[PDB]
Amino acid sequence: GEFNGSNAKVFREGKARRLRRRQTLTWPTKCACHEKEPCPFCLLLGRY
RNA sequence: UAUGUGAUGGAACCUCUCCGGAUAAUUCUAUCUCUUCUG
Ligand SMILES: [Zn+2]
């Protein structure tokens, strides 16, 4: 996935913003995942 | 009743300090009671 960037505001009427503070895990990359046919993890996340 | 590519809040002991204490022989004698009718 990506797990970066984003524009979370933790509210619709305030800036504040919501961000991570811990470490994100990794796994080796296999197959092709893109906009047309996202992998199940990206489909759940909806990063595209 | 959220709004979405990002939430270690299991991420914090109502904790700390303070003699239910102090004083006292289970002992012992003076009355009580008010209206009587000329005396
Ligand atoms: Zn993917």
Coordinates of all heavy atoms in Angstrom, one line a residue, chain A:
Chain A
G1 N 0.8 -1.2 0.0 CA 0.0 0.0 0.0 C 0.8 1.3 0.0 O 2.0 1.3 -0.4
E2 N 0.2 2.4 0.4 CA 0.9 3.6 0.5 C 1.1 4.1 1.9 O 2.2 4.4 2.4 CB 0.1 4.7 -0.3 CG 0.9 5.9 -0.6 CD 0.5 6.6 -1.9 OE1 -0.4 6.0 -2.6 OE2 1.0 7.7 -2.2
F3 N 0.0 4.3 2.7 CA 0.1 4.7 4.1 C 0.9 6.0 4.3 O 1.6 6.2 5.2 CB 0.7 3.6 5.0 CG -0.3 2.5 5.3 CD1 -0.1 1.2 4.8 CD2 -1.4 2.8 6.1 CE1 -1.0 0.2 5.1 CE2 -2.3 1.7 6.4 CZ -2.1 0.5 5.9
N4 N 0.7 6.9 3.3 CA 1.4 8.2 3.4 C 0.6 9.3 2.6 O -0.3 9.0 1.9 CB 2.8 8.0 2.7 CG 3.8 9.1 3.2 OD1 3.4 9.9 4.0 ND2 5.0 8.9 2.8
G5 N 1.0 10.5 2.9 CA 0.3 11.6 2.3 C -1.0 12.0 3.0 O -1.0 12.4 4.1
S6 N -2.1 11.8 2.3 CA -3.4 12.0 2.8 C -3.7 13.4 3.3 O -2.8 14.2 3.4 CB -3.7 11.0 4.0 OG -4.9 11.2 4.6
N7 N -5.0 13.7 3.6 CA -5.4 15.0 4.1 C -6.4 14.9 5.2 O -7.4 15.6 5.2 CB -5.9 15.9 3.0 CG -5.6 17.4 3.2 OD1 -4.8 17.7 3.9 ND2 -6.4 18.2 2.5
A8 N -6.2 14.0 6.1 CA -7.1 13.8 7.2 C -7.3 15.0 8.1 O -6.3 15.6 8.4 CB -6.7 12.5 8.1
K9 N -8.5 15.3 8.5 CA -8.7 16.5 9.3 C -9.4 16.2 10.6 O -9.8 17.1 11.4 CB -9.6 17.5 8.5 CG -8.9 18.0 7.3 CD -7.7 18.8 7.6 CE -7.1 19.4 6.3 NZ -5.8 20.2 6.6
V10 N -9.7 14.9 10.9 CA -10.4 14.4 12.2 C -11.6 15.2 12.5 O -12.1 15.1 13.6 CB -9.4 14.3 13.3 CG1 -9.0 15.7 13.9 CG2 -9.8 13.4 14.4
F11 N -12.1 16.0 11.6 CA -13.3 16.8 11.7 C -13.6 17.5 10.4 O -12.7 17.7 9.6 CB -13.2 17.8 12.9 CG -14.5 18.3 13.3 CD1 -15.6 17.5 13.3 CD2 -14.6 19.7 13.8 CE1 -16.9 18.0 13.7 CE2 -15.9 20.1 14.2 CZ -17.0 19.3 14.2
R12 N -14.9 17.9 10.2 CA -15.2 18.7 9.0 C -15.2 20.2 9.2 O -15.1 21.0 8.3 CB -16.6 18.3 8.6 CG -17.7 18.6 9.6 CD -19.0 17.8 9.3 NE -19.7 17.6 10.5 CZ -20.9 17.0 10.6 NH1 -21.6 16.6 9.5 NH2 -21.5 16.8 11.8
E13 N -15.1 20.6 10.5 CA -15.1 22.1 10.8 C -13.9 22.5 11.6 O -13.9 23.5 12.3 CB -16.4 22.4 11.6 CG -17.7 22.3 10.8 CD -17.7 23.3 9.6 OE1 -17.2 24.4 9.8 OE2 -18.3 23.0 8.6
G14 N -12.8 21.7 11.5 CA -11.6 22.0 12.2 C -10.4 21.4 11.5 O -10.5 20.4 10.8
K15 N -9.2 22.1 11.6 CA -8.0 21.6 10.9 C -7.4 20.4 11.7 O -7.4 19.3 11.2 CB -7.0 22.7 10.8 CG -7.5 24.0 10.2 CD -8.4 23.7 9.0 CE -7.7 23.1 7.8 NZ -8.5 22.8 6.6
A16 N -7.0 20.6 12.9 CA -6.4 19.6 13.8 C -5.5 18.5 13.1 O -4.3 18.5 13.3 CB -7.6 18.8 14.5
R17 N -6.1 17.7 12.3 CA -5.5 16.7 11.4 C -5.2 15.4 12.2 O -5.0 15.4 13.4 CB -4.2 17.2 10.8 CG -4.4 18.3 9.7 CD -3.2 18.3 8.7 NE -3.3 17.2 7.8 CZ -2.2 16.5 7.4 NH1 -1.0 16.8 7.8 NH2 -2.4 15.5 6.5
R18 N -5.2 14.3 11.5 CA -5.0 13.0 12.1 C -3.9 12.2 11.4 O -3.9 12.1 10.1 CB -6.3 12.1 12.0 CG -6.2 10.7 12.4 CD -7.5 10.1 12.6 NE -8.3 10.0 11.3 CZ -8.2 9.1 10.4 NH1 -7.4 8.0 10.6 NH2 -8.9 9.2 9.3
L19 N -2.9 11.8 12.1 CA -1.7 11.1 11.6 C -1.2 10.0 12.4 O -1.7 9.9 13.6 CB -0.5 12.2 11.4 CG -0.8 13.4 10.6 CD1 0.1 14.5 11.1 CD2 -0.6 13.1 9.1
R20 N -0.4 9.1 11.9 CA 0.1 8.0 12.6 C 1.3 8.4 13.4 O 2.0 9.4 13.2 CB 0.6 6.9 11.6 CG -0.5 5.8 11.3 CD 0.2 4.6 10.6 NE -0.8 3.7 10.1 CZ -1.4 2.7 10.7 NH1 -1.1 2.4 12.0 NH2 -2.3 1.9 10.1
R21 N 1.6 7.5 14.5 CA 2.7 7.7 15.3 C 3.6 6.4 15.5 O 4.7 6.5 16.0 CB 2.3 8.2 16.7 CG 1.4 9.4 16.7 CD 1.9 10.4 17.7 NE 2.4 9.8 19.0 CZ 3.0 10.5 20.0 NH1 3.4 11.7 19.8 NH2 3.4 9.8 21.1
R22 N 3.1 5.3 15.0 CA 3.8 4.0 15.1 C 4.4 3.6 13.8 O 4.4 4.3 12.8 CB 2.8 3.0 15.7 CG 1.8 2.5 14.7 CD 0.8 1.6 15.3 NE -0.1 1.0 14.3 CZ 0.3 -0.1 13.6 NH1 1.5 -0.6 13.7 NH2 -0.6 -0.6 12.7
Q23 N 5.0 2.4 13.8 CA 5.7 1.9 12.6 C 4.8 1.0 11.9 O 4.1 0.1 12.5 CB 7.0 1.2 13.1 CG 8.1 2.0 13.7 CD 8.6 3.1 12.8 OE1 8.9 2.8 11.6 NE2 8.9 4.3 13.3
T24 N 4.8 1.1 10.6 CA 4.0 0.3 9.7 C 4.8 -0.9 9.2 O 6.0 -0.7 8.8 CB 3.5 1.1 8.5 OG1 2.7 2.2 9.0 CG2 2.6 0.2 7.6
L25 N 4.2 -2.1 9.1 CA 4.9 -3.3 8.7 C 4.9 -3.4 7.2 O 4.2 -2.8 6.5 CB 4.2 -4.5 9.3 CG 4.5 -4.8 10.8 CD1 3.8 -3.9 11.8 CD2 4.2 -6.3 11.1
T26 N 5.8 -4.3 6.7 CA 6.1 -4.5 5.3 C 6.1 -6.0 5.0 O 6.3 -6.8 5.9 CB 7.4 -3.9 4.8 OG1 8.5 -4.8 5.3 CG2 7.6 -2.5 5.4
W27 N 5.7 -6.3 3.8 CA 5.8 -7.7 3.2 C 6.3 -7.6 1.8 O 6.1 -6.5 1.1 CB 4.5 -8.4 3.3 CG 3.3 -7.5 2.8 CD1 2.9 -7.3 1.6 CD2 2.4 -6.8 3.7 NE1 1.8 -6.5 1.6 CE2 1.5 -6.2 2.9 CE3 2.3 -6.7 5.1 CZ2 0.4 -5.4 3.4 CZ3 1.3 -5.9 5.6 CH2 0.4 -5.3 4.7
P28 N 7.0 -8.6 1.3 CA 7.5 -8.6 -0.1 C 6.4 -8.4 -1.1 O 5.3 -8.9 -0.9 CB 8.2 -9.9 -0.3 CG 7.6 -10.8 0.8 CD 7.3 -9.9 2.0
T29 N 6.7 -7.7 -2.2 CA 5.7 -7.3 -3.2 C 5.7 -8.4 -4.3 O 6.7 -8.8 -4.8 CB 6.1 -6.0 -3.8 OG1 5.9 -4.9 -2.8 CG2 5.2 -5.7 -5.0
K30 N 4.5 -8.8 -4.6 CA 4.2 -9.8 -5.6 C 3.1 -9.4 -6.5 O 2.3 -8.5 -6.1 CB 3.9 -11.2 -5.1 CG 5.1 -12.0 -4.5 CD 4.7 -13.0 -3.4 CE 5.9 -13.4 -2.6 NZ 6.7 -12.3 -2.1
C31 N 3.1 -9.9 -7.8 CA 2.1 -9.6 -8.8 C 2.0 -8.1 -9.1 O 2.8 -7.3 -8.7 CB 0.7 -10.1 -8.3 SG -0.5 -10.3 -9.6
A32 N 1.0 -7.7 -9.9 CA 0.8 -6.3 -10.3 C -0.5 -5.8 -9.7 O -1.6 -6.4 -9.9 CB 0.8 -6.3 -11.8
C33 N -0.4 -4.7 -9.1 CA -1.5 -4.0 -8.5 C -1.5 -2.5 -9.0 O -0.5 -1.8 -8.8 CB -1.5 -4.0 -7.0 SG -2.7 -2.9 -6.1
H34 N -2.6 -2.1 -9.6 CA -2.7 -0.8 -10.2 C -4.2 -0.3 -10.1 O -5.0 -0.9 -9.4 CB -2.2 -0.8 -11.7 CG -2.8 -2.0 -12.5 ND1 -2.0 -3.0 -12.9 CD2 -4.0 -2.2 -12.9 CE1 -2.7 -3.9 -13.6 NE2 -4.0 -3.4 -13.6
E35 N -4.4 0.8 -10.8 CA -5.8 1.4 -10.7 C -6.8 0.5 -11.2 O -7.9 0.4 -10.6 CB -5.8 2.8 -11.4 CG -7.1 3.4 -11.5 CD -7.5 4.3 -10.2 OE1 -6.5 4.9 -9.7 OE2 -8.6 4.3 -9.9
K36 N -6.6 -0.1 -12.3 CA -7.6 -0.9 -13.0 C -8.0 -2.1 -12.2 O -9.2 -2.4 -12.0 CB -7.1 -1.4 -14.4 CG -7.2 -0.3 -15.5 CD -6.2 0.8 -15.3 CE -4.8 0.3 -15.6 NZ -3.8 1.4 -15.6
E37 N -7.1 -2.9 -11.7 CA -7.3 -4.1 -10.9 C -6.6 -4.0 -9.6 O -5.5 -4.6 -9.4 CB -7.0 -5.3 -11.7 CG -7.9 -5.6 -12.9 CD -7.3 -5.0 -14.2 OE1 -6.1 -4.6 -14.1 OE2 -8.0 -5.0 -15.2
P38 N -7.1 -3.3 -8.6 CA -6.4 -3.2 -7.3 C -6.4 -4.5 -6.6 O -7.3 -5.4 -6.7 CB -7.2 -2.2 -6.5 CG -8.0 -1.5 -7.5 CD -8.3 -2.5 -8.6
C39 N -5.3 -4.7 -5.8 CA -5.2 -5.9 -4.9 C -6.3 -5.8 -3.8 O -6.7 -4.7 -3.5 CB -3.8 -6.0 -4.3 SG -3.4 -5.0 -3.0
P40 N -6.6 -6.9 -3.1 CA -7.7 -6.8 -2.1 C -7.3 -5.8 -1.0 O -8.3 -5.1 -0.5 CB -7.7 -8.2 -1.6 CG -7.3 -9.1 -2.7 CD -6.3 -8.3 -3.5
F41 N -6.1 -5.7 -0.6 CA -5.7 -4.7 0.5 C -6.0 -3.3 0.0 O -6.5 -2.5 0.8 CB -4.3 -4.9 0.9 CG -3.9 -4.2 2.2 CD1 -4.7 -4.3 3.3 CD2 -2.7 -3.5 2.3 CE1 -4.4 -3.7 4.5 CE2 -2.4 -2.9 3.5 CZ -3.2 -3.0 4.6
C42 N -5.6 -3.0 -1.2 CA -5.9 -1.6 -1.8 C -7.4 -1.4 -2.0 O -7.8 -0.3 -1.8 CB -5.1 -1.4 -3.1 SG -3.3 -1.2 -2.8
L43 N -8.1 -2.5 -2.4 CA -9.5 -2.3 -2.5 C -10.2 -2.0 -1.2 O -11.1 -1.2 -1.1 CB -10.1 -3.6 -3.1 CG -11.6 -3.6 -3.5 CD1 -11.8 -4.7 -4.6 CD2 -12.5 -4.0 -2.4
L44 N -9.7 -2.7 -0.1 CA -10.2 -2.3 1.2 C -9.8 -0.9 1.6 O -10.6 -0.2 2.2 CB -9.7 -3.3 2.2 CG -9.9 -3.0 3.7 CD1 -11.4 -2.9 4.0 CD2 -9.2 -4.1 4.6
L45 N -8.6 -0.5 1.3 CA -8.1 0.8 1.7 C -8.7 1.9 0.8 O -9.0 3.0 1.2 CB -6.6 0.9 1.6 CG -5.9 0.6 2.9 CD1 -4.4 0.3 2.7 CD2 -5.9 1.8 3.9
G46 N -8.9 1.6 -0.5 CA -9.3 2.6 -1.5 C -8.4 3.7 -1.7 O -8.8 4.8 -1.8
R47 N -7.1 3.4 -1.8 CA -6.1 4.4 -2.0 C -6.1 5.0 -3.4 O -5.8 6.2 -3.6 CB -4.7 3.9 -1.7 CG -4.2 2.7 -2.6 CD -2.9 2.2 -2.2 NE -1.8 3.2 -2.5 CZ -1.2 3.2 -3.7 NH1 -1.5 2.3 -4.7 NH2 -0.2 4.1 -3.9
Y48 N -6.6 4.2 -4.4 CA -6.6 4.7 -5.8 C -7.8 5.6 -6.0 O -7.8 6.2 -7.1 CB -6.7 3.4 -6.7 CG -5.5 2.7 -6.9 CD1 -5.4 1.3 -6.6 CD2 -4.3 3.4 -7.3 CE1 -4.2 0.7 -6.8 CE2 -3.1 2.7 -7.5 CZ -3.1 1.3 -7.2 OH -1.9 0.6 -7.4

